[PDB]
Structures are given as structure tokens and as C-alpha cells.
Amino acid sequence: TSSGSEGNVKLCSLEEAQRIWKQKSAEIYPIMDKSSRTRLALIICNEEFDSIPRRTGAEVDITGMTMLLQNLGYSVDVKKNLTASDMTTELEAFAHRPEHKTSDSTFLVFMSHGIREGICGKKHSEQVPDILQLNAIFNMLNTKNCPSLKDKPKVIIIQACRGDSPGVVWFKD
Amino acid sequence: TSSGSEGNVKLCSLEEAQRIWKQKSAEIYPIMDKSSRTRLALIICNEEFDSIPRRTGAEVDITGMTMLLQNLGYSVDVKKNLTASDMTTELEAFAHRPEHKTSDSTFLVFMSHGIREGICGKKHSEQVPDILQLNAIFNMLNTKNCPSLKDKPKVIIIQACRGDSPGVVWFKD
Amino acid sequence: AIKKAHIEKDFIAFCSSTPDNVSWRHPTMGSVFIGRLIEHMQEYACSCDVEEIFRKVRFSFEQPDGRAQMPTTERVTLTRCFYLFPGH
Amino acid sequence: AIKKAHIEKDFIAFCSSTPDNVSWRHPTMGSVFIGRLIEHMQEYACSCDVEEIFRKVRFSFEQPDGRAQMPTTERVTLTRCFYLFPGH
Numbered sequence: 001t002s003s004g005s006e007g008n009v010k011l012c013s014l015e016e017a018q019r020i021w022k023q024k025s026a027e028i029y030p031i032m033d034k035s036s037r038t039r040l041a042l043i044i045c046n047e048e049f050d051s052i053p054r055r056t057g058a059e060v061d062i063t064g065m066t067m068l069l070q071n072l073g074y075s076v077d078v079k080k081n082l083t084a085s086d087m088t089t090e091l092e093a094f095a096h097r098p099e100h101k102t103s104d105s106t107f108l109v110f111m112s113h114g115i116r117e118g119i120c121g122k123k124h125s126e127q128v129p130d131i132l133q134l135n136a137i138f139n140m141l142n143t144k145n146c147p148s149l150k151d152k153p154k155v156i157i158i159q160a161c162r163g164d165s166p167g168v169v170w171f172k173d
Numbered sequence: 174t175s176s177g178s179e180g181n182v183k184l185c186s187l188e189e190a191q192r193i194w195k196q197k198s199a200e201i202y203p204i205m206d207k208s209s210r211t212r213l214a215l216i217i218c219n220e221e222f223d224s225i226p227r228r229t230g231a232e233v234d235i236t237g238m239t240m241l242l243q244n245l246g247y248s249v250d251v252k253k254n255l256t257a258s259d260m261t262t263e264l265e266a267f268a269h270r271p272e273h274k275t276s277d278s279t280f281l282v283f284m285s286h287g288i289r290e291g292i293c294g295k296k297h298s299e300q301v302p303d304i305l306q307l308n309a310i311f312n313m314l315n316t317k318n319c320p321s322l323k324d325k326p327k328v329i330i331i332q333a334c335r336g337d338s339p340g341v342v343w344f345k346d
Numbered sequence: 347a348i349k350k351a352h353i354e355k356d357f358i359a360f361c362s363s364t365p366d367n368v369s370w371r372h373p374t375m376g377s378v379f380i381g382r383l384i385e386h387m388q389e390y391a392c393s394c395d396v397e398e399i400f401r402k403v404r405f406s407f408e409q410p411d412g413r414a415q416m417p418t419t420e421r422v423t424l425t426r427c428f429y430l431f432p433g434h
Numbered sequence: 435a436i437k438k439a440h441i442e443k444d445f446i447a448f449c450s451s452t453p454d455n456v457s458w459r460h461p462t463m464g465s466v467f468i469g470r471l472i473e474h475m476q477e478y479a480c481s482c483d484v485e486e487i488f489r490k491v492r493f494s495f496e497q498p499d500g501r502a503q504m505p506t507t508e509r510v511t512l513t514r515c516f517y518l519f520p521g522h
């Protein structure tokens with residue numbers, strides 16, 4: 001049944017959890033007790049823009065990701081229509097959250113327009129660039145700037161274009 | 174025995190090859206028949222430099238990688254002390270090699286000094302940069318510029334610094 | 347006492363397409379990469395580590411159509427397998 | 435007839451350290467990343483796909499010392515598992 005907290009996510013049984021604990025030795029990331037852990041996740045989604053096309057359909061992505069990360073046991077922050085500077089501010093605030101200390105992992109989701117150089121903020125134009133670089137996301141979440149998440153998986157998901165190209169070439173059989 | 178063509182590389186038995194064929198379905202890269210396949214590999218190693226410290230010990234890396242890739246069934250090209258332009262020329266020539274058509278995969282090994290931006294050529298200095306970018310390595314080996322290697326694993330190994338930083342931060346217990 | 351730690355470790359990034367290239371989005375159905383990721387997560391979180399799941403998402407894009415893209419795993423410093431153990 | 439293919443696919447890069455950071459090399463023993471990669475390849479090529487092997491190389495660097503580094507897997511577009519099947 002999908003009525004529980006995990007929803008449509010297929011459950012891992014205790015027998016399955018033991019087999020995984022056996023097939024691989026001490027090469028799995030430790031998970032914290034469910035009763036005490038405070039898992040956090042952050043979604044930043046830009047749909048409304050000043051100078052570039054509206055990202056119609058983004059709400060479906062927000063719903064899906066929010067529900068998914070909740071199903072996996074994460075408390076989800078959803079931030080919408082931010083400039084690159086606002087994204088940085090939010091990321092910095094997210095890295096400072098005390099719950100990360102009593103968490104075993106995190107998820108970061110960025111959904112926006114993008115170019116080769118990085119992710120588009122709300123105020124982006126070719127004339128006045130407003131870009132958050134992937135490099136900066138890593139820097140803000142590393143051991144120096146986010147010591148709470150040391151030794152813990154940090155999964156970063158990005159839905160965005162990385163240029164204008166269709167990503168295809170032709171070949172004959 | 175390490176006297177055979179595979180040397181110190183532990184062999185995969187036929188029983189092991191069947192178990193892997195079973196545990197994962199059609200989610201393994203096909204390998205070509207050993208009798209007919211022409212696997213190629215390229216090592217570019219820079220040790221002697223014009224304006225930056227000598228990479229003493231590189232010869233041990235050349236020996237090890239050359240023998241390893243041969244053990245795994247690859248014919249190895251070894252190119253030494255090249256400028257970024259020479260590296261590009263060699264990469265372009267490597268992508269044009271007809272053997273790739275009768276191969277199932279490739280390995281590319283770069284061993285040099287490096288900075289944040291990429292790999293140092295032989296003529297590198299802070300005044301006059303001589304850098305090959307990782308991006309360009311991918312471009313030269315993709316489906317557009319190397320159609321022979323379409324659908325085939327392309328493994329790129331890089332031994333190089335990526336900046337000046339020690340890669341460490343302190344923490345207390 | 348003080349001890350050394352790696353400044354960057356235990357990261358995995360998953361991008362919707364390869365560098366230079368576009369990623370697709372339906373105005374009512376949402377982004378395909380996002381929808382595909384959820385579907386694979388729901389299905390495989392119980393049995394596969396996130397890296398495996400990401401590869402499977404990639405495999406699902408293998409056959410190109412009119413709107414083709416190839417999701418890319420970037421800057422991986424996971425030293426162990428990350429299992430979600432859903433339900434636990 | 436003509437058919438579409440992904441411009442970039444079936445790649446895996448393995449770098450000696452994380453971005454911004456140095457990688458180490460011994461003047462008589464060679465580079466540590468290189469020596470470690472060979473050792474793990476020799477040991478695990480028979481049983482593990484290259485991605486698994488690369489993760490294991492990473493794990494071997496987990497405990498930092500005076501000369502610390504964290505090898506990084508980059509720009510992965512492998513859609514399947516790459517097994518070397520040594521001896522075959």
C-alpha cells in the first residue's frame with residue numbers, strides 16, 4: 001500500500017537489508033536510527049523569470065521531488081524563483097542547519113534554466129548574467145563550510161540545460 | 174602464475190563470467206572476441222618540463238600503467254613530454270585509428286603537472302600558460318569526433334594536481 | 347586533539363544532460379529527467395545504491411528520439427555505497 | 435537511412451584528486467593514485483566493474499595522512515556496467 005509515509009517507493013525488507021549488509025562488507029554508508037534522525041533536503045526551483053521563458057510544468061517536478069524525498073525520510077525545504085545570490089544565501093543557511101548533525105545524509109535539488117557555465121537565477125539575461133556555478137554548490141557543502149555533513153552522502157540533483165545543443169549526431173547503419 | 178599475458182592481474186574464470194552475466198541482465202557492455210579484437214590504449218606522460226619541476230618517479234607510473242593495460246588486452250601507445258598542442262594532435266590521431274572499429278573499448282591515461290583549469294603541457298609557465306582542458310579530451314573522443322568508439326566505454330585516467338591546496342581541513346574529536 | 351579530514355568527500359552530482367546540451371521538459375507532464383529519476387528511485391531504492399540507480403536512469407535514456415538527452419553523474423567522491431534502505 | 439546517436443556517451447573519467455587540490459608522487463615509488471589504481475585493477479578486474487573499482491580506490495584514500503588526496507570520478511555517461519573480464 002502507498003498510504004504509508006514511503007508512498008509509491010518500494011520498501012526494503014529486513015531480509016533484504018541483511019543481504020545487502022552481507023554482499024558488501026564495511027563499504028556501505030551508515031544510516032542513523034529512524035526514531036532520532038533529522039534528515040533534511042532542499043529544493044530550489046525557478047519557474048517564473050524576468051527575461052527568459054517560463055518553465056511551465058515545473059510544479060509537477062516540485063510535487064514529485066518533494067513527495068519522493070519525504071518518502072525516503074527527508075524533511076523538505078522548497079524555495080522558488082531566486083536569484084543566484086539568493087540561492088547562495090539559502091545554501092549557506094541550509095549548510096548551517098543544526099539537524100544535519102543528527103542526520104546521516106542530504107539531498108540538494110536544483111531545477112532551473114541553465115547554460116554551459118551553470119544554473120540560471122531569476123534575473124538572468126545574456127546582457128546581465130545571473131548564474132550559480134556547480135563548483136560553488138560543492139564549496140558551500142564541503143567539510144570546510146559544512147562540517148556537520150562530514151562523512152555523510154551529499155546528493156546533488158540538477159534539472160537544467162547546459163547549453164543550446166540538441167545533444168545528437170547522425171550515423172548510418 | 175604471472176608469466177602469462179595478464180601478468181599480476183587476477184583472472185576471471187568462466188564460472189565467474191557466467192555469474193556476472195546472470196546477476197546483471199543486458200546491463201553489461203559487450204566484449205568482442207579475443208581472437209579478432211584490436212584494443213587500443215594511449216598514455217601521455219610529461220616528466221621533463223621547461224619551466225616547472227621535474228616529475229621524478231613518472232617512469233615507474235609509465236611502466237605500471239603500460240604493463241597493466243597490456244595485461245587487460247590493450248595495445249599501448251606511450252607519448253612523452255608534449256605541449257598542449259602536441260597532446261591535441263596525438264589525441265586527434267588516436268581517435269582516427271582504424272583499430273577502434275574492431276575494438277570494444279579504450280583507455281586514455283594522462284600523467285603530468287596540472288592546475289585548476291587542466292593539464293600542463295611541457296612549455297607551461299604562469300606567464301605563458303600551456304594547458305589541455307579535460308573538456309577538450311571528451312570532445313575529441315565523443316561520437317562526433319570519434320564515431321568508431323560509439324557505444325564503447327572510454328575510460329580516462331588523469332594523474333595531476335588540480336591546484337595548490339593540500340585538500341585537508343582540521344576537526345576535533 | 348585535532349585531526350585531518352578531506353575537504354571534499356562523499357559527494358555525488360546528477361545532471362539532466364551532458365555539457366553543452368539541452369534538457370527537456372513537458373508543460374503538463376514535467377521534466378523527463380525528474381520524472382524518470384523518481385520512477386527509478388521508487389523502484390530501485392530498496393535494492394540498489396544511488397550510483398547504480400543513477401546509471402539505470404542513464405540507461406533508460408540510451409535510445410535517442412526527437413527529444414534526446416544523456417543525464418550525467420559528476421564529481422563523485424562517495425567512498426562507500428549509499429543505500430537508502432526505504433522503510434528503515 | 436540515418437539514425438540519431440547521443441553525441442556524448444559511455445565515458446568515465448578518474449582524476450587523482452578533487453578540484454583545487456594537489457596529488458602526490460614519490461620520486462622512486464611513483465604516483466600513489468597510479469600505484470593504487472593498478473593494485474585495485476589487478477585485484478578486482480575479475481569481479482568488479484570499473485566504476486566499483488574506482489570507488490574502492492577512493493575508499494583506500496579515506497583515512498587522511500600527511501599527504502592526503504581524494505581521487506574523483508568525473509563526467510560519467512556509462513549506461514551499462516563495464517567489466518574487463520580479464521583472461522577473456
Ligand SMILES: *C(=O)[C@H](CC(=O)O)NC(=O)[C@@H](CCCCNC(=O)c1ccc2cccc(O)c2n1)c1cccs1
Pocket residue numbers: 055112113114159160161162164368369370371372373377378413
Ligand atoms: C533548458 O534550460 C530547459 C530545461 C528546463 O527548463 O528544465 N529546456 C528548455 O527550455 C527546452 C524547451 C522545453 C520546454 C518546451 N517544450 C514543450 O512544450 C514540449 C512540447 C512537446 C513535447 C513532447 C514530448 C516531450 C516534451 O518534453 C515536450 N515538450 C529547450 C529545447 C531546446 C532549446 S531550449
Ligand SMILES: *C(=O)[C@H](CC(=O)O)NC(=O)[C@@H](CCCCNC(=O)c1ccc2cccc(O)c2n1)c1cccs1
Pocket residue numbers: 228285286287332333334335337456457458459460461465466501
Ligand atoms: C602536481 O602537479 C603534482 C602531481 C604529479 O606530478 O603527479 N604533485 C606535486 O608536484 C607535489 C610534489 C610531490 C613530488 C615531491 N615529493 C616528494 O619527493 C616526496 C617525498 C616524500 C614522500 C613521502 C611519502 C609519499 C610521497 O609521495 C612522498 N613524496 C606537490 C605537493 C605540494 C605542492 S606540489
